[PDB]
């Protein structure tokens, strides 16, 4: 079962990283295709993906167990814009 979790964090707007979209199966495949189209970093991390999928529903902010693992993702994925 394929899963994809789309995280959004923008300083000043989102008080915490936000799960803005999720998908399983066909929808997960589509999210990944769109990620490629828009050059959004995609990271494979099976334990984290499964746990996020189960715990943090679409439109929910991440919770404490995820703060650091998601921070690490943001640090590698952030576009520094130069």
């Amino acid at each position: 079962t394929h899963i994809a979790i789309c995280l959004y964090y923008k300083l000043g707007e989102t008080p915490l990283p936000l799960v803005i979209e999720t998908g399983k199966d066909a929808k997960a495949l589509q999210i990944i295709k769109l990620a490629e189209l828009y050059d959004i970093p995609v990271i494979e991390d099976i334990p984290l993906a499964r746990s996020l999928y189960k715990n943090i529903h679409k439109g929910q902010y991440i919770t404490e167990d995820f703060f650091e693992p998601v921070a690490q993702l943001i640090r590698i994925a952030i576009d520094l814009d130069y």
Binding site: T1, H2, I3, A4, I5, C6, L7, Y8, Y9, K10, P17, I20, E21, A28, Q30, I31, I32, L34, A35, L37, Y38, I40, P41, V42, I43, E44, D45, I46, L48, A49, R50, L52, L73, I74, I76, A77, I78
Partner: peptide, 17 residues
């Protein structure tokens, strides 16, 4: 239509299994 694509376009990172 288009909400999915607009969300992905603005997103920060995707985690997958």
């Amino acid at each position: 239509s288009g909400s999915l694509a607009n969300n992905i376009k603005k997103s920060t990172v995707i985690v997958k299994n």
